[PDB]
Amino acid sequence: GLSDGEWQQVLNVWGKVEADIAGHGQEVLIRLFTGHPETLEKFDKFKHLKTEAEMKASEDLKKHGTVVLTALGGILKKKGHHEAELKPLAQSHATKHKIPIKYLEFISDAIIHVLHSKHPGDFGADAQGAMTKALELFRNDIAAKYKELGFQ
Numbered sequence: 001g002l003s004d005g006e007w008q009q010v011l012n013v014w015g016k017v018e019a020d021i022a023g024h025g026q027e028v029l030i031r032l033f034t035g036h037p038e039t040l041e042k043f044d045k046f047k048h049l050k051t052e053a054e055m056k057a058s059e060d061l062k063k064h065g066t067v068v069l070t071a072l073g074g075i076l077k078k079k080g081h082h083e084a085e086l087k088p089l090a091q092s093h094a095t096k097h098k099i100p101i102k103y104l105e106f107i108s109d110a111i112i113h114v115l116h117s118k119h120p121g122d123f124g125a126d127a128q129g130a131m132t133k134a135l136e137l138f139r140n141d142i143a144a145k146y147k148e149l150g151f152q
């Protein structure tokens with residue numbers, strides 16, 4: 001549950017991501033894969049990437065980064081009213097991709113990390129607080145659908 005002031009901060013921060021969605025998307029995925037290598041195993045089309053250099057050089061990884069952040073942005077722009085947008089994502093990630101909720105925690109923190117890295121001194125305390133709450137909300141609503149499906 002976010003205030004309007006907090007949503008405003010979220011969408012303000014998101015404006016940064018939208019100026020370069022592929023660059024941000026790329027760095028988030030790289031931060032995830034290198035920070036948590038077990039996550040790489042869930043991707044049959046990235047599992048070949050052994051080195052971070054190969055990750056950085058991968059246009060298909062950048063492509064998928066765009067897909068992921070485009071979807072997250074669509075959801076964020078709903079300001080919490082994202083049931084229709086979120087349900088198919090929860091369903092595919094539980095039933096097809098088999099992504100435990102722990103990995104959504106991983107990518108959440110990675111987004112926070114990337115924003116500080118790309119915008120040092122430009123991602124203030126209030127902005128981080130708002131973005132973190134927004135990602136917690138996202139995660140929590142996925143978690144509810146996971147529970148429904150009995151997925152661990």
Ligand code: HEM
Nearest residue numbers: 039042043044045067068071072089092097099103104107
């Ligand atoms: C902000 C969080 C995330 C968002 C918004 C997101 C979004 C998406 C979207 C839109 C797709 C393509 C449509 C679909 O299959 O449902 C997708 C595919 C996929 N996602 Fe996610 N995702 C997120 C997190 C994760 C995480 C943390 C993992 C694994 C650690 C993951 C694993 C996958 C895999 C394996 C696919 C299919 C890739 C392929 O073979 O094309 N996702 N995701």
